[PDB]
Structure formats: C-alpha cells, structure tokens
Design a protein around this ligand. Structure first.
Ligand SMILES: Cn1cc2cc(-c3cc4n[nH]c(C5CC5)c4n(-c4ccc(OC(F)F)cc4)c3=O)ccc2n1
Ligand SMILES: Cn1cc2cc(-c3cc4n[nH]c(C5CC5)c4n(-c4ccc(OC(F)F)cc4)c3=O)ccc2n1
Ligand SMILES: C[S@@+](CC[C@H](N)C(=O)[O-])C[C@H]1O[C@@H](n2cnc3c(N)ncnc32)[C@H](O)[C@@H]1O
Ligand SMILES: C[S@@+](CC[C@H](N)C(=O)[O-])C[C@H]1O[C@@H](n2cnc3c(N)ncnc32)[C@H](O)[C@@H]1O
Lengths: 382, 382
C-alpha cells in the first residue's frame, strides 16, 4: 500500500562462528578488566575447524590464562563434543598477542589526564533510536535476535535436543510511514537456519521452527496468510560452527547495532577497551539517541560523531531527526552540547566502561537490552 | 548555517592491515578464477606481526600456490623489508583452508541450473548513489580515498621516501540540503595518519602532508581559514602495518562502500565468489542505484535487497529516493522489476562476476571507480 515499505534485518546465534569470535574477544577483555581496570586491549579472534587463534595487542597488569578463558567461553556457547563439529575441551588455542604499540600508547594515553586521553583511533560512529518499540530499537532486529535466543533456550533446556549452537535468522517487516517515524504493520518474511544433528528430518525441524520458535516469539497479530517462511531453506545444516565457515571478530557489526537501520561507521566493538572509540563512542551515541527519544524531543533520530587519534574532543557531531522533532538540528545539537561530553575519558566515567560486562554484550546485539548504562536515558536540561 | 550539516567519512591505504587482508583474500580469489571460473571461494585472511594466515573454504579445480600468491600481493603493497615492519620475502604464510561444506554446496548450487542457483547465504545488502559527484559517490569518501592514493603515489615515485604503506585519512564536509539531495560546501576537517621512517621529523611530515598531499587532492575552493587539519595527530607512527595492529578480511566494509552514507547490510566483499550475495547483490544494488541516478529518475537513492540461503530470488526489495524523484517508491520498484533480475545466477552474467578483477576492487573502495560493470548504468525501459 502507498506510504508503506519493507525492511529486512538479520541476527545470528551464539554459536555462529563470527559471534563465537566476538564472545571470545570480549571474554579476554573482561578477564583483563577483572584484574586491571586500565588494561589496553585489542584482541581479535579467528575461528576455523578445531582452532581458536587470538591475534592483537594487549598491555595489562593482569595475569590471564588464555587457554582457560577461551575454552570456558566455547563451553558456554555449547560446543562440547566432536559430534557437534567443535569441542572446547580438545580444540587448538593459539595465541599471537603482543604489547600495544608504544607509538599508539604515547600518542593516545601516556602521561595524559584520564578525562583528556586522546581517542584511540580516528573514525566515525553513529547512534540511532526509534520509538517503534519500548526499548527504542527497530522491530526487525529485535525479532531476529529473539528468534536466535529462543533456539538457544530450546537447545539448552533439552526441548529440541537436535539443535546445535550455530544459527541465523532474518525478519522482513512491512512498515507504515508516520511523519518520519515508522509503524510496524506485519511480518512479511522469516528465515531461520540452524545447525542440527544427523538424525532429525527436515519436516520435523520445519514444524518445530514454526510452532515452537516463531510462534513463541513473534506476536500472532503480525503473522498472516501471506507471511513467507524459509525454514531450513538449505535443506541440510549438519556441518556448522567454525567447521562450516571461518569466523572472525567484528564481522557482525550490523547485527551488533541496528540491523541496517540508522547508520554505521565501520568499527567493530568486541575485544576493545574504552579508549577505542569504535566501541565507546558508538555506545555514547546510542545513549544520546535514546535520551533524545525517551526525552520526547523526537521519535526517530540518528547521531554521527567522529574522532582523530590522539585528540579527545570529537571532530564533528551531527543530528538527523527524520522530520520527527519540532526542534531544528541546530537546537538538538545545542541540547546535546549542554548535556553530554563525548570525550572518551568522560564517556568511560558516565558509562562505567572499565566494568567487565563486555562478554554479555557480544551476542543478541549491544543495544536495546538489559539496561546497560548506554540504555538508561539521561534526563536532559534545556 | 540553517539547512547545512556535517558528514564525515574515512578511508585507509593499501598497507592498512585490514586492507592487506582484503587484497590478499581477493588475490587468492583471482588466482582461482584464472583457472576455474566456477571456483567456490570463501577465503578469510588474518595479519599480525610476521604472519599471513588464510582460513576458510575453497572448492576449485585450480592448482594455486598460496605462498606465491600471498607474497606477491604483499610485495605489491610495498612491505618488502624488516625496517618497514613486514616483508613479503620472509614472513610466515600459514594455510587453514578446507573444501566448501558439502551441506552448503548441496543447498546452494549442486545440480542447479546456473540462472537458478540459490543465494550462497541469507542476508541484506544496500546500494546507494548520489548526484553530488559525476561518479555518483559521496564527496567525503571520494576525497578520503584519493588522499590515501596520493600517499601511495608519492611513496612509490620516491618523492616522500619516508612514507610507509599503512595510512588512514578522514574528511568532514559541510553540506547544503537541496530538496533531499546534498551539495558540498566546504571541507571542515581533514585527518591524515601515515606510517613513516625513523628519520623524518614531525614538522617535515606535517608540511608535506598539507602541501604535497592535501593541496594535490582537495580543490582549494573547499579549503578556507577555518578548515581544521589533524596531520600525524598521534605524533609518531613508526611501528605500523600488521605489527602495529592485527588486520582481518572484511573489517573495512564502510570504507569499501559509501563512507557511512546510504546503508550497509554487514557483509564483507573480499575473498568471495559470485554465489556469496554479500558481494554480488551489493554490486548489483549499486548498479541499480547508479542506473536510477544516471537515468534521471532521482538525485539520491537507497536500494535494499535481501536473500535466503538456497533461494534464488530476493526475499525483499525496497527503494528510498530521499524525496528526489517525481515517481513514487512503488513506481521505482516497478521500473527496477522490469529492468533488473537480481538472482545471483543472472547478476553473474550481467556483471561478469567470474572475471578475475577482484584484487583491483580491494583498496580505494569498490564503487565509483574505473568503470567496473556495476558502475556502467543500465539504460532503463519504462
Ligand atoms: C513522511 N514519511 C516519509 C517516510 C519514509 C520512510 C522510509 C521509507 C523507506 N523505504 N525504503 C526505505 C529503505 C530502503 C529500505 C525507507 N526508509 C529508510 C531509510 C533509511 C533507513 O536506514 C538505513 F537503511 F539507512 C531505514 C529506512 C524510510 O525511512 C519512513 C518514514 C517516513 N515518513
Ligand atoms: C529538504 N532536505 C532536508 C534534508 C536533510 C538532509 C540530511 C541532513 C542530515 N543531518 N545529519 C545527517 C546525518 C547524521 C549525519 C543528515 N542526513 C543524512 C542522513 C543519513 C545519511 O546516511 C546514513 F548515515 F544513514 C547521510 C546523511 C541528511 O540526509 C539532506 C538533504 C535534505 N534535503
Ligand atoms: C553460508 S556460510 C558463508 C559461506 C561459506 N563460507 C561457504 O564456503 O560457502 C555463513 C553462515 O551460514 C550458516 N551456515 C553454514 N552452513 C549452513 C548450511 N548448510 N545451511 C544454512 N546455513 C548454513 C552459518 O551460520 C555460517 O556461519
Ligand atoms: C590505532 S590502530 C587500532 C588500535 C590498536 N589495535 C591498539 O592496540 O591500540 C588502527 C589503525 O591505526 C593506524 N595506526 C597504527 N599505529 C598508529 C600510530 N602510531 N599513529 C596513528 N595511527 C596509527 C593503523 O592504520 C592501524 O591499523
């Protein structure tokens, strides 16, 4: 219908190989932060059949047992037997970690007052918020994440014991335009692909995915006779995890954020401490966007920020309200200037970014969940 | 001023460690395609001090010497001596490549007519085009790429022999809003960081970056007394390449596309054959967007498509013209339906995607350059 459009977002499960890497990178970050709140961490993870490799740079006073940290993260995910394609007990864990470059350290944080630390890199970052859900996230991505979480729940509780940890989901919603804001109308298409054991047949899987997964997550009001279902569309997914597809940290950046809505500056979150603005400034930009929506200044908003390595203040700040505010971009920028300080050395304090809660962010999206500091709106003064 | 806003984009050089990985992944893809046009390639690359690791899945009739292909790509980039932090002659090249999963193969392409091959994965992809430049790309990202290309040119011609291959640039432009389209007004901020030798001083570098790099790339009409320059803002960048920062394939997806403009579905391009719609459908979506702008139907346009693994036709198609077309989204969608076939097995034919030209795409952006097939607009019938 006129004034409507489709939008699609995807999500992946905890055992998707890229997501395994994000979770391991953040388990390593958390392990360091538990002993050294000021650890400098830049931990990439790579996963392929039988292998977890850590590559990157860490300067920290912590004593971390990488073998134990990696294996415990893989155990949590559920890869605990060679029949599943990967086993935390018996996989190879390889470590290629060096200190942070002294050239970066001297230009970013050495001999600097914490509030005045430089950005750990240049880059651009965006924050986004939409009033279409209470949590201020797009419905497409929320539903896609919840479908993966449901698969993991039914795997872990033994309801569907043929499930394995690697999964992907995709949701297409038809939206109505509403003066710049968007209103979900119906779910147009759902995709679910999930790794499974050798014994279960396709019909049993398709029936369970519709009845026990989709119906348990997606409100019936969004589903109708025209909704298209692609359930196990490849027909067979026994080989999975890193054995089926090499994974890397920071290869699910759109799943981690807004499912394609808003915008993205390209930076990966996992495996990085607060001085890496790819993460901290994106979290702060989400916090600003959500504060503008919860504060009633707009219904839908996009915030861009950018930095130069070694420089504390952002180089640029931009706000686009999609036509959903009575205030101009200039007025919203002035409100943001009066209420937020987007230097990394201040974001760390406001968002408590030395706390070891990062592994919890590394599956099911970094935003719209669990009342993390960047999800608690700031009361705005103007 | 009212009706203006800032936008920032970045780019990186050929020796940035993530970009090294993209180029090696695509050198491996091209090597396979030279012998087997139907090679199934999913080659991830990881780079850290002294190491190139290939991890992924390849099923191909080609006989490829990975040691030679990798080392030749690194030689081209310019890492040819231990003084530069990396040397193609003496680095470690490790290979963890297996066949493509037979479960993926059977669900995607085995026993399928080429035109009717399934998408190689689920996912979402976007195309974007803007009339602000002749090549239909945002000025921010074009300038950022050209600044890196200029550094490589002056390194290779011996003008600035202290330059090394690893670089990053960032450009902020102030734009005027123009009925949904955008008009560049001025360059607000430029960042340049580039790896250098131990002998050159900061003042010599800053002067050269302004006079021989910025002035040689950015038209003087965009630069004024208020333009901010952050040139070598870290103060020292001797350690660089993989030694300074671990690189991975598909960690520069925003640099590869539109510099943050438009939208991105999350997929990486490099190291993948045409059946991986993360690449082929994004190229086709750019081709559609550019065709709509060059055809005079809009000034600025965003196209979303999405797929399910094993299914040939896209699940969804959406078009947003930013208010720059007299035609509705419905009319533009009908034009696209009548003029394009976005099945991967048809995109391969239209865009000649079995040709080994991929290494050429893997630095300086995949779009707006060199009249690749996706940059040559299709004449539209309606
Ligand atoms: C008066 N009015 C007019 C409106 C128009 C739209 C709207 C329509 C639309 N059709 N196709 C898309 C995109 C291609 C899929 C649309 N997008 C859209 C644009 C950017 C987005 O984020 C990121 F992708 F850049 C997300 C969605 C809209 O925003 C929404 C609300 C409105 N109100
Ligand atoms: C009548 N009219 C009104 C217009 C408004 C804008 C426009 C203003 C603007 N302010 N801040 C931004 C973004 C935060 C940086 C703006 N964006 C924008 C939105 C999305 C973009 O892509 C991707 F990031 F999603 C890129 C730019 C505009 O498009 C442009 C043209 C117009 N014409
Ligand atoms: C399809 S694979 C990417 C392509 C792959 N590298 C190849 O060699 O063709 C991407 C993701 O899809 C999922 N996947 C793996 N095997 C699958 C299968 N048989 N059916 C459906 N999805 C699968 C996993 O989540 C995997 O990480
Ligand atoms: C700043 S590093 C990312 C952070 C890093 N992993 C760490 O341990 O802090 C990202 C990119 O910046 C560039 N870079 C490396 N060393 C730099 C330096 N001393 N000054 C400026 N940029 C640098 C390289 O292009 C590198 O790939």
């Amino acid at each position: 219908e006129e004034g409507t459009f489709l939008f699609t977002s995807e999500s992946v499960g905890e055992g998707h190989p890229d997501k395994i890497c994000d979770q391991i990178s953040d388990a390593v970050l958390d392990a360091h932060l538990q002993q050294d709140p000021d650890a400098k961490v830049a931990c990439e993870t790579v996963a392929k059949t039988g292998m977890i490799l850590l590559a990157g740079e860490i300067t920290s006073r912590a004593a971390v047992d990488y073998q134990k940290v990696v294996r415990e993260a893989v155990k949590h995910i559920g890869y605990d037997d060679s029949s599943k394609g990967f086993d935390y007990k018996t996989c190879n864990v390889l470590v290629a970690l060096e200190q942070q470059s002294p050239d970066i350290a001297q230009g970013v944080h050495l001999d600097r007052n914490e509030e005045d630390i430089g950005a750990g890199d240049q880059g651009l970052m965006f924050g986004y918020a939409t009033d279409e859900t209470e949590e201020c996230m797009p419905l497409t991505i929320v539903l896609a994440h919840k479908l993966n979480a449901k698969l993991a729940e039914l795997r872990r509780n033994g309801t569907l014991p043929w499930l394995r940890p690697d999964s992907k989901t995709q949701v297409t919603v038809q939206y109505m335009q509403d003066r710049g804001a968007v209103l979900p109308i119906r779910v147009h298409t759902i995709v679910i692909s999930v790794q499974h054991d050798e014994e279960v047949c396709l019909d049993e899987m398709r029936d369970a995915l519709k009845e026990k997964v989709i119906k348990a997550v997606v409100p019936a009001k969004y589903l109708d006779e025209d909704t298209i279902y692609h359930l196990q569309p490849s027909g067979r997914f026994v080989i999975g995890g890193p054995q089926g597809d090499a994974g890397l940290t920071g290869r699910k950046i759109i799943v981690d954020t807004y499912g394609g809505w808003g915008a993205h500056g390209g930076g990966a979150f996992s495996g990085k401490d607060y001085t890496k603005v790819d993460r901290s400034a994106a979290y702060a930009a989400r916090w600003v966007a959500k504060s503008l929506v919860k504060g009633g200044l707009c219904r839908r908003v996009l915030v861009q920020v950018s930095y130069a390595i070694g420089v504390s203040h952002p180089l640029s700040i931009s706000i686009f309200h999609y036509g959903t505010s009575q205030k101009s971009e200039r007025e919203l920028l002035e409100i943001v200037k009066k209420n937020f300080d987007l230097r990394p050395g201040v974001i760390v304090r406001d968002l408590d970014l030395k706390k070891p809660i990062y592994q919890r962010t590394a599956a099911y999206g970094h935003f719209g969940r669990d009342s993390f500091p960047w999800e608690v709106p700031k009361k705005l003064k103007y």
